[PDB]
Design an enzyme around this catalytic site. Structure first.
Site, PDB file in Angstrom:
ATOM      1  N   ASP A  38       0.845  -1.182   0.000  1.00  0.00           N
ATOM      2  CA  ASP A  38       0.000   0.000   0.000  1.00  0.00           C
ATOM      3  C   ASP A  38       0.896   1.253   0.000  1.00  0.00           C
ATOM      4  O   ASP A  38       2.120   1.165   0.131  1.00  0.00           O
ATOM      5  CB  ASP A  38      -0.951  -0.037   1.200  1.00  0.00           C
ATOM      6  N   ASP A  97      -0.502   4.972   1.359  1.00  0.00           N
ATOM      7  CA  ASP A  97      -0.733   5.938   2.434  1.00  0.00           C
ATOM      8  C   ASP A  97      -0.689   5.259   3.799  1.00  0.00           C
ATOM      9  O   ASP A  97      -1.417   4.297   4.059  1.00  0.00           O
ATOM     10  CB  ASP A  97      -2.057   6.679   2.252  1.00  0.00           C
ATOM     11  N   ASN A 106     -11.139   2.865  11.860  1.00  0.00           N
ATOM     12  CA  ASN A 106     -10.111   1.848  11.744  1.00  0.00           C
ATOM     13  C   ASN A 106      -8.781   2.366  11.247  1.00  0.00           C
ATOM     14  O   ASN A 106      -7.750   1.735  11.500  1.00  0.00           O
ATOM     15  CB  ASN A 106     -10.574   0.765  10.768  1.00  0.00           C
ATOM     16  N   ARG A 152     -18.681  12.172   8.110  1.00  0.00           N
ATOM     17  CA  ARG A 152     -18.168  11.249   7.104  1.00  0.00           C
ATOM     18  C   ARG A 152     -18.176  11.900   5.714  1.00  0.00           C
ATOM     19  O   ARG A 152     -17.177  11.856   4.980  1.00  0.00           O
ATOM     20  CB  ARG A 152     -19.021   9.972   7.168  1.00  0.00           C
TER      21      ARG A 152
END
Ligand SMILES: [Mg+2]
Ligand SMILES: [Mg+2]
Ligand SMILES: [Mg+2]
Ligand SMILES: [Mg+2]
Lengths: 475, 475, 475, 475
Positions: A50, A52, A152, A200
């Site tokens: 990955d 970031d 998360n 969000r």
């Protein structure tokens, strides 16, 4: 001292590659690779990454504060009250992995069975008996995703604090009336669930339409950890196998960030010619849309590297030099690099999107980066005294007057946890492990404060975990 | 010696209730209550029970053979070839928890990550390299329920063997042609998935429309373990708390089976008046339809105890003496008995429907009955020699020529496993735990060969499990 | 002469309200209100209105051309080839209501049973036998919405032409290879379905993020029909009942458009004080999201009329003077105005979102605006000669050599249809009605070239339709 | 005189095949083929047939009464009260096509837009104003299939009456309390929806597990219309094209019923050798599961004609002589007979499963059998006086005191409707057509009291319907 202050300490160091220096440096906990299931590095044929918070670690708390500021400004821009503008990000409040309950507006720390470990309404920490009003049985169905959102990733740290900030603000602003599920202001009703969706919405918006990328990229030194040991590890991996990138970010952002991560006046080692970041990879795939990536994926597209735009149509050609992909699926990587899942060690920070999904759906090997582990290790080693007293009490409680013995438990767990922050350790609350801790042990074969810790292990190390026994098997 | 021969040995014994006899008897592994997560019996207010293979253990292999015979006869009755009639159940083949792959017609033993541990096509055990043809990466997505069926209960033992029998039979009968996904006979094609559905259809049919209940009930001594210690434990539970039954079986079958389980010329202890089985329960609920029971359930109905038929309409009254319920939900039990989830210890054998679902959805405490544990414990203790050699080799392999060292691993695991049966132990294949073993440790707070082992523990025992540490936490 | 040239002719006229002038003016077809099911105006208590292409008719072809230009520019901006820039909108090609088949890249004109009436691939009109290659049985399942997109609104006229333009362009550009389902350019494959999604994406984008609203609003006279008779009809409705607006557009666009529609130096009649458009309505609802509006809707929000932003939270108050709503549902209107469905005549142009859905889901009365009806009526009246010959041939064919008689049918239908455009009439292809024509008769109680035609009917007219008889009923 | 008394009158007649006798006999309404859309018989290549209530018409009211009796007995067998046993089927109550509303327990007659035409609660017919309590706006969303069940086939006539019987019985039995949505008896609540499901469950059960087939088959003359003209029409069809059967019934029931339908001491005509029913068909397909048949279908199976059991596995062979199919799809027929949809005229009685679905999904031509049309035609012709007065009043009402004019409408419609039965005509309530009438005109190209009416039309007749004009088109 933030946790990215630790990572940017070891990062300012060139790597002495004496084989006795690596073996000794490695044993220091901050640089260990921790092992949940045995893994034979010699059997890994492809390393995948990955970007970031894996290759590009954002400096804390500068970055969380920027995202919190932009998110606050967006909310005020759509109608939230001006007072939000005087909020200021506080890194000592939030801990990653909390669960926001959109019904009652609480942040919850839960264990793997959804048992309540901590419960905060705004900044008021609700103690045991009062949580039974809203949570009889002190438990949540943590898979009821209509009600519960698990914060998360490190990207969720700003909204973790902001949710508490808003609940606090509306609770105490006399213009509003607190109800079980939200606030009334005359004829308008703002449910906690509405409010949560707006937050969000706003975080997404600053990431994809607002200015966060722009402000990040125009001050990379302020916001992004850079480490001369990254291009060394990548080249060393390329000699034993293939290396690929599979990130959710788009190509223009990926190129800016990756270019900076390699912006040294040398290549892999001091003295070598600098090489473009793209030459360190056999397969570059942007716009991955993990975890959907690990199921059917999306159609394979080709990036026009000159313009940053996707070429029109579905890419049907073979792996060829220079090519960048968009979309596709994990099966794109397996086909194009000739790999099976267990030849792959995928290295990332998203316990769900990167690790859990690549393990359950494809059988990939997994390496979880946990940036806060540097600070977590410090607190856990330094204040080991208290946890040792904790485990002593936990046992003498079983031999048995415990009127006062439970009180010393609940006291000692509180002040242990406080050394981490107001939401306590990422991995536990007292003697009880968190959901997050549980998913680390369950789905991350290896984990580490940084993927760079792999540099201190020989080419074909066998990471070894203890074999597990059922109760009746050790009887 | 079947595993129900062990359980029917300890069952022929009246219980000496001297507190030194129970403490000593308890330490013998066959009678232990094993502990995955600590549980304070004093905090349990309601004990709840499944019936089939929990209160009523069917004698093996008589019962599996009867169900296999009836299922075979049903398949021939709908058109399968007469040769099936000469199949005969063999208890040494199947192990519980196998996965039938409806695409290729293989029985698989998998670990918690879906890695292949054993793979049998009919009675041909496929070795490593050949399984890579059909399972590259030697892995299955065990949650792809369209392709994979996990044979989880003792009810599935007859079909576990029968599936192998059919694959064997059609493979070797010259009338048919084997293809990757099934068999051709001229212009008819029978896919493994079609064949698997017919077996599943037939097992259901003998349970709900054929004669299996009838033949069971007219020879209960032949098919059902009966133990004078069951009515003693139930009455002892009733003094510390409430006791309830929540079974999927209907009321007429429940009454026959339960009446027999209490058919002694005494009550709880020798010398006491016999009491009807219904008096041992505060709440009796049939037709539970677990696991749906642990979500929204079905409508609460009332059984007409005189006729065995359900009364028409939805029952709206309170808990009252004499009443039997049909349908409803777990929340019926909590309301009617005034319990929260963690006041409940639910006792059952279905790792999915009874245990996993009551833990994740409601936070209930759990007790898993594993009837085969008696025989599993015997094999594991007696042949401990081999597992100890296994663990020795597993470590000296890590220090390192392993041309020949892997060969002694693969040899030693095979002959260890063989002592259990052709599909090996329910809990492991060599040094590797099974999916089933993993779900036991994960969702069963307590487990035991029989729930009767609770009789040998004092009223308020605190079952204690070791606290768990992450790798970096024991560093 | 476009169809909005007709509507802007009758719109430049003040209304003589002599009751003999209205009755005579009304009988002229261009100003009729046509009746599918009888409707007693006296029983209508609320008149409700869409906005775009109902109160605000965009001048053709200026507006379609602007949207086509912006959509083309967007596609080139994301990577489509520069040649698109030389496309120019042609109003004689597209007819509303066509079906794009995303599998084979054809525009289809279908009847109510999905039988093919016209089939064009790019600008090549496919004749009968060749359409059987791709459409055996010359039929499509018109409800298979994964494959077929029905271009139903005047908003879809630019993309109707553009889809043909692209299919034409790629078919004839030597860089590409035509396949059954799209075009290859080396290693890129553009399916017709991919291409169709890009066009749909681009039209949405210019409407909601590009400049179409901006360019519209800065030249309203060029793009929007304005009629002094609209504020007269609205005020006349307000004397017999309530008037409401329920549009999908947002409040800022609604306010600009509506303000212009009332921008006269008088009020309802010449000589009266001008009033703001908002005073003509009892209930104004923006952001309606029809047709979802006619089911569960979205949450009722309140517009901050000063800023154009939505107030935070769900609006709970009553209907009060000055208030503007966002979201909600059709039930918002019924409650707040005290209406049942059949007290409502809803006036709109979307045969699906406005008319069909409000009829089937709520039982509302319906008024369908069809702007092209002005030009359609002209062509149909003027060239009635040809349709009369058509119906003559259709009958003498039934008495019966028809080698040559079918040829005169197929010839006469072609040249009849051509007078409308290359895709022929909106309502029929020869003697066969279109899907669109069928849904008009089926779900629009009334229809008209303009809602203004209601001005020429007395306050309590009873619109009358012929009663319908089954074949056996007229026997 | 039942409606099957008409059909069994014309059925006792051998067919005079003089071409002037057929043309004259045909013009009598009872024997017409009525035409909704023109159909050229010469273009039909395959004739396809349903069985129950198409080839095999069950004599009324004997058959409905048998099914009502068995359904009542089943309900009492599961616990309903003994009084049900004294119910007796009454053919004058129910009309096909009614809608049971499971919320309020009403039988409704609706038009195509779901407007209420008749509303009966038990046997109490609710007049206009009182229906507004439960149906404001006097309308139902007829596609809300969770609430509303449309009793569409002649199979639903017994349950149509039974639902009214039960609502009547519980309403007036003092043991129960009527609530808005059902009945209370102490602590049991029976909702109308529960009650409706039990009736539906019971009707299914007598058809598929009870004795209805058995009692039918052991007295075929009592229950099934037999007509010597059926084998004549089938053979005549076989000379112009192919003939197929596609029925939902299983093979054993199909064989008994079909054998009886051909049980004459001759073949097609008196004097010819009798032939087995199977020889009249090119393709026989049982277990069709229409309407799913007209979408993806089920797997194609082969019937073992000797045993009546399905062969194991999926049938892969070609069409061959003697073969019977199970399952499959409409595409089975098209492939195996080489037909496109519009070469097919499918002949059946299920307006939904046979007609609507084969038209919308496949473009098949359609022939709807309506057995009650014989009696409906009689009532409509004989009492034409009243409908003519109806249409007179309907018009003079429009010219206009109508205090008393609406009263003569509502009076005249009531007594018109009563001549049909208590639920009135299948096709209309007064001047208003029913949903059923609407779907006949919409999806049945042809319809007739019996498919036998096709015998009276020449080999290549062109059934002709009037062409349809929109209001503005006849202006
Ligand atoms: Mg990441
Ligand atoms: Mg059980
Ligand atoms: Mg509109
Ligand atoms: Mg039928």
């Amino acid at each position: 001292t933030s946790w990215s202050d630790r990572l940017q300490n070891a990062a300012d160091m060139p790597a002495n590659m004496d084989k006795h220096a690596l073996k000794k440096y490695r044993r220091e906990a901050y640089h260990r690779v921790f092992v949940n299931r045995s893994l034979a590095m010699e059997k890994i044929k492809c390393f995948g990454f990955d970007m970031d918070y894996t290759l590009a670690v954002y400096k804390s708390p500068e970055y969380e504060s920027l995202g919190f500021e932009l998110t606050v400004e967006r909310l005020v821009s759509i109608g939230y009250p001006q007072e939000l503008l005087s909020f200021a990000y506080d890194s000592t409040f939030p801990t990653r992995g909390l669960v926001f309950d959109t019904l009652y507006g609480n942040l919850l720390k839960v264990d793997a069975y959804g048992n309540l470990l901590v419960c905060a309404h705004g900044f008021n920490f609700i103690r045991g008996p009062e949580t039974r009003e809203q949570y009889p049985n002190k438990f949540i169905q943590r898979d009821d995703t209509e009600r519960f959102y698990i914060l998360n990733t490190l990207f969720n740290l700003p909204e973790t604090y902001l949710l508490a900030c808003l609940v606090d603000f509306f609770t105490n602003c006399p213009r509003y009336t607190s109800c079980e599920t939200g606030f009334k202001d005359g004829d308008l009703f703002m449910s906690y669930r509405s409010m949560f969706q707006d937050v969000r919405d706003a975080v997404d918006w600053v990431h994809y339409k607002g200015s966060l990328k722009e402000k990040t990229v125009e001050n990379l030194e302020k916001y992004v950890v850079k480490d001369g040991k990254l291009p060394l590890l990548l080249s060393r991996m390329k000699e034993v196998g293939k290396v690929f990138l599979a990130t959710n970010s788009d190509y223009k952002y990926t190129d800016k960030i990756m270019t900076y991560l390699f912006d040294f006046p040398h290549g892999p080692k001091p003295g070598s010619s600098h090489r473009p970041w793209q030459s360190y990879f056999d397969l570059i795939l942007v716009d991955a849309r993990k975890p959907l990536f690990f199921g059917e994926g999306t159609v394979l597209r080709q990036v026009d590297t000159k313009t940053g735009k996707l070429k029109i149509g579905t890419y049907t050609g073979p792996l060829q030099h220079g090519i960048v992909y968009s979309g596709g699926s994990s099966d794109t990587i397996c086909d194009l690099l000739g790999a099976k899942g267990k030849d792959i060690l995928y290295i990332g920070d998203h316990i769900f999107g990167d690790i859990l999904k690549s393990k359950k759906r494809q059988g990939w090997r997994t390496f979880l980066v946990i940036p806060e582990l540097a600070q977590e290790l410090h607190v856990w080693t330094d204040k080991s005294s208290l946890f040792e007293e904790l485990q002593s009490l936990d046992i003498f409680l079983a031999e048995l007057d415990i009127s006062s013995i439970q009180r010393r438990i609940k006291k000692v767990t509180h002040d242990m946890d406080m050394c981490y922050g107001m939401m306590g350790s990422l991995f536990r609350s007292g003697s009880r492990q968190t959901l997050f801790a549980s998913q680390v042990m369950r789905y991350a074969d290896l984990y580490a404060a940084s993927f760079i810790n792999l540099l201190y292990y020989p080419f074909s190390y066998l990471f070894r975990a203890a074999h597990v026994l059922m109760p009746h098997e050790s009887t």
